[PDB]
């Protein structure tokens, strides 16, 4: 008989720990794995997959239609959208990005923001997005806007653009929840010169936006998401 | 490893920015390629976002209740809570089923910790130590009947005994039929018109049972389990659109009808911060 | 002088050439193999029809106007009924499959819409009545006609809402699955190639569809000053390495 | 040390260190490169 | 070692007793600089004031309380301690608190003990044996609500269960968002004319929840939970004046008004002794 | 299974005791350390600086 | 005395784990094994031998 | 380990599947001896139908 | 690591991985061949 | 022996045994020998 003490802990069950179980199943033998294609390892993994973002929130009930930026023809100096950026919140939360976030407490790195034109081809146009780092108010007008980092698009053959919001911060890491002094900035996009519709054409044409991490990112503390619940547990 | 490279001023013709998301790639753009960069490492390594790390920790899967009462007089055992019984499963309460369901077939062994705590809401002159018996009932086996049938004898069937305040710990081997468990299945379990459809079909591998071993006291006493699952060697392919609705039924994918929209709405224009 | 947008597929006794492509996807970055001896369990030697099943079937055309929602196809069903593909079907027990996917829709330059095209592994749909009802067998087994998301209900089909692809998931996020646009201004076909996925090795072609393929569109058609408002969009689809093993009577199967 | 017999029984796995967006983001028949034009 | 060379009489030109205290020095005069010495070597290495030893000791950080009872008929659970909670911190109680803020910045992991004791303040027939359930809810991450929400399924979130009487343990590693964990902050979380000032705003890493697993029994049972906190690996930056006046807040540097003399006054002269 | 005795003192929680305990937080990684003046590792250190004595206690 | 901590399952008593035990007859010797023809070692080596199935079931 | 070997037609003078019952033998043929089968291998070692297991828990 | 002294207290036995189905199966004297005639 | 697999598990740390006293008592920039004139 071997001495022993025991410490403080004792027969605790922390759902977090990781320790050997006697196998209730001696000498089962599992089914072969065969190939499958597809195979995750990290979350890291598919965060960098671009999804679409309902930008245009503006709706009443869930619609194809908040996916859809409208711009108009011949407006000049003027702004197509707007929105922050906590990306646990707002436009973002549904997105795959979001979605992934909101399991994990912390996040840092580059966000890359990209926007795909789907008006006429014979039509064009000329946009800039601005990215407005934390400490400024969201941009009033392109004036305003075009100091901070900012990219004009030229609508082509190239139908889409990607702009990235490159990590700019003191503290390295910020909140997923929003929270004001981990506050990341402001997106907003101003007509450049304006969207120009041929002849025999009209209305409105819609620019389609994607969110997806650049390979720079960090994800730490997972946590539980404000993204689902229950009240009983469900049946067959 | 870096995190960013040092990039200056560029004027060329070669512009990474610029490209055809209608091709279904996502070209990996960094900060360097549209503005001035210096260099910065990565200190980081994604360790706590692998799989094995994610679908890794304890989750509650099953809460159910079993009392200690006077058996003499009762029809129906099973009906009494005098013993009772889970149609093992994973999707009851929901936090670990949307995780898991970020994923089509998902491969694990399971560690199940089971925890029991006792109940006495009327007048009792004690607590009183109570051992409950959780046996695994697979298909194709008699399922108890009473509360202390031949059933319980589990001579060839894995049963552990522990005490209730006490917890239970094992662990099973990944016992899927196939490959992989799916978490979604597009099928039925044959051609039939009116089979049931989805995943409730493969998902199958019977029951857990439980009873108190002890015979009754003066007074009654409610025990309740609550079942944890712990996902270990975990592997996962295909990965899905997380679930956006709520859930409504073990195994269908169905969703609640006059939901509410799940996207919030702006307060202000397309142009509001 | 090879564009990404100029392509030639030729499988079988059948070709098709699109001048307008943006490139191709390859699901999961796979392209679609037979079954190797490792991975195999059922002993039957399997049979490999090659040349005859392994050609495009162009199903029957669809028409995108103003107010589409989206349309959705299952495989192997929509394939149920064509030439030899369709009778090896019924007469195994056991066949698997991957398939070349190409989607087609031209306009002109003054045209704008943007369809998304997807591929879903193990696409589980929803019944409309919430709860746990099922979504009968017929329902799921539209054939050659697929799923048309601005039908209505009907009792014992599945949802057809779109913001929800059908099962409680964001249209949004469909893009996790391997797809593709087709943007009038861009793009005039889509061509996905589909490896067999699955958690078995070969599975019965009948109780279980392992693929939807959605066209949805997203940026609504607007065509010219006063042109018809309409487009058509074709599927045609071809069978890849395909094999089918335990060979009989012939199944029936509901409706 | 593992102190049981079977492999079910053994601790959590340890990290895949695996690693590898590309058949999730770039699934692309004919390849892209980065800076060279999306359709040719 | 030597504390203290052998030294003899001096007259000498060379004087290391006059020194500027003006320049901000503190010269390292010795008595071998102005009497005469022996040698004596020191026996002593200075161990036990090594700043790990010196935070290195569990001290009580929270001392809160939760019931066990019927909540039939209870509007707000957490208003009835069905389940309190603790919005993280470390300097409710002081005594640890003036010694972390010795130091500016503080780096550590942390080890919680919890120990938990209950009490039965009016007539029970016994003492019933009650599992605590205390998990740890970051920010950004539904708060319970009821004393068995299906926020306790806990799939995500560390949670321990242990039994009243008995203590828990664990330890987190160091979660601050920085490189160290403020102990002061001369800031705001904007530039806002309202914002509140100081650290409770970096300081915050959501709350700690508590709640007992048992139904309930007829009679009601007091459960009050201690939690300690120990540092390791701890590091420590920029030595500060020790706290003089008692403190009033969590996270504010403020004293108390009309607070009383800090400094003994003599009983007697300057020239007393 | 190995046969052990357990001793007197089991089960204490002394508050100066130093072992190893499982972390709650599994993988997690910690943010690198950044450089800052002042680092001080003895108490000896510091007591070392001279400050002002209040001397003059008689108001 | 060295330090211990006792995990979740402690105590439990699982009808499929194997461990060992104390012999409550030390030293005791056991009758030898002589030779018996027909050893089986796995039910696989059995359900090999064929028998009869009552095929016309309905009596 | 071969669950089944490959195994094509035959025509042969020499037939494994007819035999004599009345012996008490039970002759071992497969699936290959009657259809045409391809590879496939076993992945299973029958450790838990071992008396031991059978018989002890 | 036995920490008993008696065989008997040790853990369960180890897979026979011996297997042999011709005691039961194949008891003929004169050995029959798969293939040449049952009844010659 | 860890028996644990983080590092935050592990027990305290041990005597940093380092000790440097000048960051603190002698900041000046022109170096003051003891002995010497303060101020010359
Ligand atoms: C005593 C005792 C009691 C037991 C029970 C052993 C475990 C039996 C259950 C096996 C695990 O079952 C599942 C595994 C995975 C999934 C699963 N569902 C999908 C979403 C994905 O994975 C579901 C179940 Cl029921 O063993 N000994
Ligand atoms: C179950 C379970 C429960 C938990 C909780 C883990 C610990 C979470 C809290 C993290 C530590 O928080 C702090 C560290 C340092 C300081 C600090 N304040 C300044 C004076 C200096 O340091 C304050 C807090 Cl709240 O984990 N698993």
């Known amino acids: 008989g071997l ?56 709706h009443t009930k869930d ?25 646990g919140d707002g436009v973002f939360k549904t997105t795959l990005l979001g979605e992934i976030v909101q ?33 400024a108010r969201g941009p009033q007008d392109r004036r305003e806007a075009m100091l901070g980092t900012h990219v004009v698009w030229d609508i082509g053959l190239q139908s889409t653009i990607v702009m990235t919001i490159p990590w700019t911060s003191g503290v390295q890491f910020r909140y997923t929840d929003p929270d004001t002094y981990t506050s990341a900035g402001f997106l907003s996009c101003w007509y450049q010169t304006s969207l120009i519709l041929p002849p025999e054409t009209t209305g409105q044409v819609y620019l389609l936006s994607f969110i997806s991490a650049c390979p720079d990112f960090k994800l730490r503390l997972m946590k539980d998401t404000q993204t689902i619940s229950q009240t009983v547990a469900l049946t067959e | 490893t870096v995190a960013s490279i040092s990039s200056g001023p560029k004027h060329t013709q070669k512009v990474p920015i610029l490209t055809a998301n209608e091709t279904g790639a996502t070209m990996p753009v960094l900060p360097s390629d549209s503005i001035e960069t210096r260099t910065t490492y990565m200190h980081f390594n994604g360790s706590e976002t692998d799989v094995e790390c994610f679908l890794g920790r304890a989750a509650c899967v099953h809460v159910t209740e079993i009392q200690n009462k006077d058996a003499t007089g009762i029809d129906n055992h099973r009906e009494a809570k005098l013993f009772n019984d889970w149609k093992i499963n994973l999707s009851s309460l929901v936090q670990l089923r949307k995780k898991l369901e970020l994923f089509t077939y998902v491969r694990f062994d399971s560690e199940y910790t089971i925890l029991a705590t006792a109940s006495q809401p009327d007048s009792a002159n004690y607590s009183s130590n109570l051992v409950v018996q959780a046996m695994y009932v697979p298909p194709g086996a008699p399922n108890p009947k009473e509360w202390d049938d031949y059933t319980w004898q589990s001579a060839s069937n894995p049963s552990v005994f522990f005490k209730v305040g006490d917890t239970s710990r094992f662990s099973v081997p990944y016992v899927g039929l196939a490959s992989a468990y799916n978490c979604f299945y597009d099928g039925y379990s044959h051609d039939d018109a009116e089979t049931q459809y989805g995943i409730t079909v493969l998902n199958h591998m019977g029951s857990m049972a439980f009873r108190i071993v002890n015979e009754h006291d003066e007074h009654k006493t409610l025990v309740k389990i609550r079942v944890y699952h712990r996902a270990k060697h975990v592997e996962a392919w295909i990965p899905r659109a997380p679930r956006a609705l709520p859930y409504t039924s073990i195994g269908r994918t169905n969703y609640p009808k006059n939901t509410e929209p799940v996207i919030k709405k702006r307060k202000g224009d397309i142009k509001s911060y | 002088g090879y564009s990404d947008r100029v392509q030639q597929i030729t499988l079988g006794n059948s070709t098709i050439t699109t001048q307008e492509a943006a490139n191709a996807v390859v699901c999961y970055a796979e392209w679609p193999e037979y079954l190797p001896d490792v991975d195999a369990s059922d002993v039957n030697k399997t049979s490999k029809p090659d040349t005859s099943v392994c050609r495009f079937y162009t199903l029957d055309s669809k028409t995108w106007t103003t107010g589409s929602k989206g349309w959705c196809w299952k495989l192997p069903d929509a ?42 592994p193990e696409h589980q749909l929803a019944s409309h009545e919430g709860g746990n009802v099922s979504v009968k067998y017929t329902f799921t087994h539209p054939g050659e006609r697929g799923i048309d998301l601005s039908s209505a209900n009907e009792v014992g089909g599945p949802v057809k809402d779109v913001l929800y692809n059908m099962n409680g998931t964001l249209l949004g996020n469909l893009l996790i699955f391997p797809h593709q646009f087709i943007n009038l201004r861009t793009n005039n076909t889509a061509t996905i190639v589909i490896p067999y996925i699955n958690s078995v090795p070969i599975d019965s072609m009948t109780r279980h569809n392992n693929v939807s393929l959605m066209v949805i569109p997203i940026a609504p058609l607007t065509v010219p000053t006063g042109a018809t408002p309409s487009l058509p969009i074709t599927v045609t689809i071809a069978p890849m390495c395909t094999e089918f093993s335990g060979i009989r009577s012939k199944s029936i199967v509901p409706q | 040390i593992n102190y049981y017999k079977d492999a079910a029984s053994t601790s959590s796995a340890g990290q895949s260190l695996s690693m590898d967006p590309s058949k999730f983001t770039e699934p692309v028949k004919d390849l892209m490169l980065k800076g060279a034009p999306a359709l040719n």
């Open chain 1, 63 to 87: 619609e194809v239609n908040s996916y859809l930026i409208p711009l108009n023809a011949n407006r000049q100096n003027e702004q197509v959208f707007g929105t922050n950026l906590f990306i």
């Open chain 1, 3 to 58: 001495p022993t003490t025991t410490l403080p802990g004792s027969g605790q069950f922390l759902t977090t720990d990781d320790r050997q179980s006697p196998s209730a199943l001696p000498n089962y033998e599992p089914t072969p794995r065969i190939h499958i294609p597809g195979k995750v390892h990290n979350l890291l993994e598919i965060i960098q997959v671009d999804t679409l973002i309902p930008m245009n929130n503006t």
């Open chain 3, 79 to 120: 394939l149920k009924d064509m030439g030899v593909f369709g009778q090896n079907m019924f007469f195994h027990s056991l066949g698997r499959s991957g398939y070349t996917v190409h989607v087609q829709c031209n306009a002109t330059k003054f045209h704008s819409g943007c369809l998304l095209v997807v591929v879903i």
């Open chain 1, 103 to 135: 399991y994990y407490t912390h996040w840092s790195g580059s966000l890359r923001f990209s926007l795909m034109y789907t008006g006429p081809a014979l039509s064009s146009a000329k946009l800039i997005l601005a990215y407005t780092p934390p400490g």
